[PDB]
A paper describes a structure:
To investigate the architectural parameters that dictate the substrate specificity and site-selectivity of a Rieske oxygenase catalyzed reaction, we focused on two Rieske oxygenases, SxtT and [name], which are involved in the biosynthesis of paralytic shellfish toxins. These enzymes share 88% sequence identity with one another and selectively install a hydroxyl group on adjacent C12 and C11 positions of a tricyclic saxitoxin scaffold, respectively. Each structure showcases an α3 trimeric architecture, and each protomer of the trimer contains a Rieske cluster in the N-terminal domain and a non-heme iron center in the C-terminal domain. The trimeric quaternary architecture places these metallocenters within electron transfer distance of one another across the subunit-subunit interfaces.
Based upon the success of identifying a residue in the flexible loop that is involved in site selectivity, we experimentally probed the location of a substrate entrance tunnel to the active site. Crystals of SxtT and [name] were pressurized with Xe, cryo-cooled, and placed in the X-ray beam. A resultant 2.69-Å resolution Xe-pressurized crystal structure of [name] revealed the presence of Xe in each protomer of the trimeric architecture. The Xe binding sites were confirmed by calculation of anomalous maps. The Xe binding site is formed mainly by hydrophobic residues Val276, Leu173, Ile172, as well as Tyr273. In both proteins, the tunnels span a similar distance of approximately 33 Å. In particular, the [name] tunnel showcases a higher hydropathy index than that of the tunnel found in SxtT and a larger bottleneck radius of 2.7 Å. This tunnel width is mainly limited by residues in the center of the tunnel (Thr230, Thr237, and Tyr273), whereas the smaller 1.7 Å tunnel radius observed in SxtT is limited by residues located near the entrance (Ser230, Ile237, and Glu272).
Author numbering:
A (entry chain C): 1 to 297, 305 to 334
B (entry chain A): 3 to 202, 213 to 296, 304 to 334
C (entry chain B): 2 to 202, 212 to 296, 305 to 334
The structure:
Amino acid sequence: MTTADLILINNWYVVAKVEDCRPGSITTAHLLGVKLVLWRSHEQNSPIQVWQDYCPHRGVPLSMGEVANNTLVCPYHGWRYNQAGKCVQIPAHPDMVPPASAQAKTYHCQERYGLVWVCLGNPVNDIPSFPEWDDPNYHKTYTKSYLIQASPFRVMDNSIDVSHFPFIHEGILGDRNHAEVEDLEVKVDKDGLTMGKYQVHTSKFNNSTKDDSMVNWFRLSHPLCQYCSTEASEMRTVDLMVVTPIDEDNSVLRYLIMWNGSKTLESKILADYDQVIEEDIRILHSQQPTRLPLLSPLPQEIHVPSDRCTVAYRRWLKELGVTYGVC
Amino acid sequence: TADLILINNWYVVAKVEDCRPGSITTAHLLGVKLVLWRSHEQNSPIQVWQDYCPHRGVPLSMGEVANNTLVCPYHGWRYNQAGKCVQIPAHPDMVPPASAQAKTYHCQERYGLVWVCLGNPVNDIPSFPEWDDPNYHKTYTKSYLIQASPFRVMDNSIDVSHFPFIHEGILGDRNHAEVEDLEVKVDKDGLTMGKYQVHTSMVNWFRLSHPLCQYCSTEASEMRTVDLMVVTPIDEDNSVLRYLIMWNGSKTLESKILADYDQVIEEDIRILHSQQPTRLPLLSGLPQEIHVPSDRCTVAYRRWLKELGVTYGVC
Amino acid sequence: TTADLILINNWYVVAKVEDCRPGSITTAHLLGVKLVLWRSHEQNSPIQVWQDYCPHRGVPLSMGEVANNTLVCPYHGWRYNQAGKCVQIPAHPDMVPPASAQAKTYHCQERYGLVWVCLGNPVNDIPSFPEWDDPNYHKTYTKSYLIQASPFRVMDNSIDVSHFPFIHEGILGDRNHAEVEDLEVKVDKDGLTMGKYQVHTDSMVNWFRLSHPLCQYCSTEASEMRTVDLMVVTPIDEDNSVLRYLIMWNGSKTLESKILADYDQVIEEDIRILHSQQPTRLPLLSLPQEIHVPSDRCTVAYRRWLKELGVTYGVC
Ligand code: FES
Ligand code: FES
Ligand code: FES
Ligand SMILES: [Cl-]
Ligand SMILES: [Cl-]
Ligand SMILES: [Cl-]
Ligand SMILES: [Fe+3]
Ligand SMILES: [Fe+3]
Ligand SMILES: [Fe+3]
Ligand SMILES: [Xe]
Ligand SMILES: [Xe]
Ligand SMILES: [Xe]
């Protein structure tokens, strides 16, 4: 169990990539305070089973075992658990039907966009949409996993912030001179939080090429995933940022990036995101308190006109009833 | 703090070989930091006290042994073998106050091991019959620091069904994983398991007179092997493992025996370090423990600890 | 924060002025508060000591840059003037920052080459040091010593004199001269005072006074040379301290490194003991309870003064 809210437990979250889960493999992960085991059978096109990493016999992690004959086997006594989590065999008592109590705690898992989505509760919410996934004109790439020692909601608040661009992202996403921020259009509606189109000022790098005027916008249907859309000179680049809430104070950041330009741009896209993500991590790791402060009437946070979309985020979290990872 | 039932039992804290004349050693029992010291005389007794000087809270272990006294390093106070301050160097003519006294504990050398009771010895040190048999040879395993409850360490050692999966080299085969109807008896002696078969041929039985001490007996084709497993309870979540192995076959087998014991212990320590909760769950976030017929000796250990009133190291 | 106001309303050294050169950003910690110390390229700019905290989104201001007499936060470039008022917000260039856009500032006074800070309202003055003005005395500063021990245990160890023959053998005593004479201890409204006493090696006469719980003035007269010192403890929190010493002497300048070496040896010998002592915090008067003998008169008096002042922070 956990101290997490039901609004959060009943949502889907990315815990891995499908390319990390090979046939016959055992992977560990952490979601909302719970340790997880992700396993597949040696069959090809095998389903991924996401359970709690715990054998109920003597408390040994099931992730220390082996996958054999479509069963996850515990290392201590060799209890064999089927795809539904039911012990189907106890080697010490091979003719005995295992007790019904011998059951692993199983969760909902679904693959989409090459990502493993998990729901610890009742899947009542839907997986965010990524329209360009099935567009053959768009190429796909994934960033590596980033472990961040900061609240899941502080990480998302940062990626909603845009006024920091000319300071901690100078040279990639901002100009320390064009640092004034225009009035921002931010909607709160049925589709979630939308930052409307807005101009990103980037520093010239190629003096031969024309200014890469970038227009960006983003939408949040889920509070820990953000769909971002950028149209520059000759390329539209969309991304799906996904935050794995490890606990109230820890988070994993992953991005699926899709672009309509030359596949040869993959290396540059991945390296440019690395720079921005690590410049953002430096601030996230220093922020206090570690949990995102919600609104109220250490001193309270101060909000200026340019914080419109981040004030609306903190408001959305109070409406959703979020108390985990926030203060 | 620990339950009186544990406070009044004997526990191994060191090997006699390592407490030399004039030496000062350290140990940790039931939450208490301990100082062990000997005088430079031969046949000197071992004094096991709390590692603390009552003047200003400095560890007496950072001091020195001099003239059959332990000297505190801060103000020079000298404590006799009974633990009483006999000289305060700033007041050389003053009879040191009665409060100037170290907290002393009972110490007894048995089986080449230093045994300590922090309470009132109500029970005797566990018996080891082959200690007095000259037909048996003697070897000691090294110390093993385990980040697990002392009671989880003993539960693992009482378990016999794990042999075919984590010990398939020495104590089990994957084609012989079935466990026969085991025999368990909890009497005044303690917890006793009746003899059972172990597949590498071998017959094995064990008895626990005390919760953290195990006597084990194994008969092979040509050799009887016995061991005394001692668990030092550092605190609720930490333990030290030691064994005294005795056998009546060739003394040349000492190295293979120690090598075999090391493999098994480090294979058990891997499961022990992973177990959650860290403290032993007793019979009463994470689901409750499930018990199968092959778990009757470990179910009896948990029942015994509950009956004895153990609340320290257990969940 | 959980500290007693008697402590919050007192002056403490958090740095030496030689460590905060023009245009620098230094960090410190005092009574649980993280502090940012910053200066200007003004050849003689003052030292600002604020809480290491940007009230916009909670970044540490110490990760910023000093520019044109302002401290600039790294996250959104907010510029705070020397009074701590934010005067620029780059996002809204022609917007006067709200009154809330203000760093939490603390009182800072430079004295004896040291940075004194008071987190509250200074009801007391910075401890006195008469040989500072005396031109016949040379001056030197020890390095900062981080001690994993209560500020009050650190000060307890400095007032102890009975331990000189055992852990400071060679500098403040030897094992053949361990008997302690009847010490003169004056506990008054001003504070704790310790009268003249003999330190062996062939001997020197020392005394000390404490007008402040965590500041000690000491005087040693030996063979015509008088050495004085000001021991300052930075209370980091209940369990941690910084130790610093300003030593002044009227002999040869050549003695400086020897003086520094003698202090360094004694201090690290004291730190070996301080780190081993349990409990970490200083036990006051009503693990076994502390026993007191006559050589411990001035250390018993320290505990009695702290209880009368109502110190609960850093004490057991
Ligand atoms: S702990 Fe998993 S089978 Fe015994
Ligand atoms: S601390 Fe042991 S003698 Fe003073
Ligand atoms: S956090 Fe300091 S300026 Fe935004
Ligand atoms: Cl399989
Ligand atoms: Cl025992
Ligand atoms: Cl003073
Ligand atoms: Fe950013
Ligand atoms: Fe084992
Ligand atoms: Fe000293
Ligand atoms: Xe980016
Ligand atoms: Xe063994
Ligand atoms: Xe000194």
